[PDB]
Amino acid sequence: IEDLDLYATSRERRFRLFASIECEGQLFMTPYDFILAVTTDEPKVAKWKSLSKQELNQMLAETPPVWKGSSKLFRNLKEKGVISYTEYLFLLCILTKPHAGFRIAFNMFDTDGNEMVDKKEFLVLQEIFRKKNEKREIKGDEEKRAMLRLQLYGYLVTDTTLLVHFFGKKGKAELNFEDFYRFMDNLQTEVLEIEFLSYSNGMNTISEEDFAHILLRYTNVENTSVFLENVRYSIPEEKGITFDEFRSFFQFLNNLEDFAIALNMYNFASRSIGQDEFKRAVYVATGLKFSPHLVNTVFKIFDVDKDDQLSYKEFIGIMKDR
Amino acid sequence: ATSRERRFRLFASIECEGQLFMTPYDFILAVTTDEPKVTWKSLSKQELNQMLAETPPVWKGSSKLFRNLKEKGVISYTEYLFLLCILTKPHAGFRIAFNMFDTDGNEMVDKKEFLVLQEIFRDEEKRAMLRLQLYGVTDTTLLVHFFGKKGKAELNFEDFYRFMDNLQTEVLEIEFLSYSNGMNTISEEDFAHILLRYTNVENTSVFLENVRYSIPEEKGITFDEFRSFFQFLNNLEDFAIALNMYNFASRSIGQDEFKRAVYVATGLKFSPHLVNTVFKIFDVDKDDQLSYKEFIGIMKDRL
Ligand SMILES: [Ca+2]
Ligand SMILES: [Ca+2]
Ligand SMILES: [Ca+2]
Ligand SMILES: [Ca+2]
Ligand SMILES: [Ca+2]
């Protein structure tokens, strides 16, 4: 409850805010609750359904096998599934990875090198985070800390939607790199689709005012309203952003590092890039092809100086790394 | 002037046509030291062009190019910037830099590709005079070394890659040797101090005093260990990707996790001595674990 927030991290408070399933004191998110957790700010309604272990396992008995993955996995599993806190963290982490990172992640999992991931490999990290936070060095409020620990990790282990989806109902299936990649690619694409569609209202395009508005979640914009007032007046016509362009730009945001390397020669010289070699830098660094409309829109959103060029802290410096 | 331009002018030693240059030794100093110790020298275009006519071809490149060329070389302000940038790129970036030059995609770099991307980076009397000073077409050591003496050779990726690798290695060797005093290893304290130029460490003295008591017995860091670690620092963002969930969970890695994370992230294999040393330098909690705000948080973004 409100009691246990005072003992909790930001991420733990937010997990608890969006979670709706309790089973033997462990709290859970449904796939819909996760979609809301990543596309929304706060829930709209307050409450909180409590399951026994076998009504939960009937809820899971459906779960599609891994080969049924699609950007619509989580929306077809609307509320018929369960996600733990660790699993939540996993999914959040996926949302920020570049595609090459999927391989870094897979290799971080495959402790033994056979190029598959056991259920038991996959479970070691929930084991690691469970143990770590427990603090036998910090005294006081042990019972409330234990309750929050239970809420977040339980106490082989309660089956979950990702656990059954990945390793089957018996837990003996294994995951190769290709399925892992497809799960993370399909989840990135799902979250992007839900945001885009949340603004398109049935069109091919979202407005650039809505584009920029979504962008401000990724920025350290000191005054949010002054920046939106800058896009509304800098761009008197709206031509609209297509889904391909919106996906292009967020794939690029996950490859921002490689972009900084590419423009490093510019930043050593304190010089600003133009839109042509901004586009070309995006291509050679990321492999993505930005439309001239997308590039032009980014420039009108971020080029405050109004030179039709972008300096280091007009774009790259302003993006947050979380 | 920008910081970088003030430093270029302070370490520069050659004038030709009002145009200023660094010699390769002046670059070594500009990269390894804090300020010069003392003489200047003015060349004509053709004594500069013979001084350059000495320059070794690409296929004689080595970790010792810049020190064998001790003061028989020429480096402009732009080329200075280029080399700085070289020093900070990870090896995976080299292909991206090369492709940033190869406007036409033939997988080679003309002299004129190289010069077009430089040349884009270019009181009325004083601003103009300083503009002459940094930019002046005038041939340089890098132009002759890369594209031959009449510049119609072109540069394939193989030689580009080895040039920036060997320049990284040259600079690292000079710093290492500046501390080894003829031994096979540098001290773990001298290691820490060198690292400290890369950190946002508020109090350096207590930090060094902490490695000195954390490592009361001295084993040394070898050059392979030292180069590996500075290679890792240029690949830190792959490292952060690897540890991303530790950072999401507010959790600390142990040395085994840390070592294997370095491998999976970068491909580099740290000796257990190297890992133990990094831990003893940075694990300040003394939990034998590293939290985000002990290591990754502490590093500067190549400022
Ligand atoms: Ca395995
Ligand atoms: Ca601008
Ligand atoms: Ca990469
Ligand atoms: Ca070419
Ligand atoms: Ca620590």
From Swiss-Prot, chain A:
GO BP: calcium import into the mitochondrion; cellular response to calcium ion; mitochondrial calcium ion homeostasis; positive regulation of neurotransmitter secretion
Q: Which UniProt keywords apply?
A: Calcium, Disulfide bond, Membrane, Metal-binding, Mitochondrion, Mitochondrion inner membrane, Repeat, Transit peptide
Q: A GO CC term?
A: mitochondrion
Subcellular location per UniProt equals: Mitochondrion intermembrane space; Mitochondrion inner membrane
Tell me the residue numbers annotated for binding Ca(2+) 2. D303, D305, D307, Q309, E314
What is this protein's tissue specificity according to the annotation?
A: Specifically expressed in the central nervous system and skeletal muscle.
Signal peptide range: none
Q: Binding residues for Ca(2+) 1, per the UniProt record?
A: D110, D112, N114, M116, D118, E121
| Keyword Kinase appears in the UniProt entry | no
Query: Has UniProt tagged this entry with the keyword Calcium?
Result: yes
Any one Gene Ontology MF annotation carried by this entry is: calcium ion binding
Q: What does this protein do?
A: Tissue-specific calcium sensor of the mitochondrial calcium uniporter (MCU) channel, which specifically regulates MCU channel activity in the central nervous system and skeletal muscle. Senses calcium level via its EF-hand domains: compared to MICU1 and MICU2, MICU3 has a higher affinity for calcium. MICU1 and MICU3 form a disulfide-linked heterodimer that stimulates and inhibits MCU activity, depending on the concentration of calcium. At low calcium levels, MICU1 occludes the pore of the MCU channel, preventing mitochondrial calcium uptake.
Record's domain comment? EF-hand domains 1 and 3 have high affinity for calcium and act as sensors of mitochondrial matrix calcium levels. EF-hand domain 2 is degenerate.
Q: How does it assemble?
A: Heterodimer; disulfide-linked; heterodimerizes with MICU1. Component of the uniplex complex, composed of MCU, EMRE/SMDT1, MICU1 and MICU3 in a 4:4:1:1 stoichiometry.
What's the name of the protein?
A: Calcium uptake protein 3, mitochondrial
Which species? Answer: Homo sapiens
Which gene is this protein's source?
A: MICU3
**What range of the full-length protein does this chain span?**
135 to 502 of 530
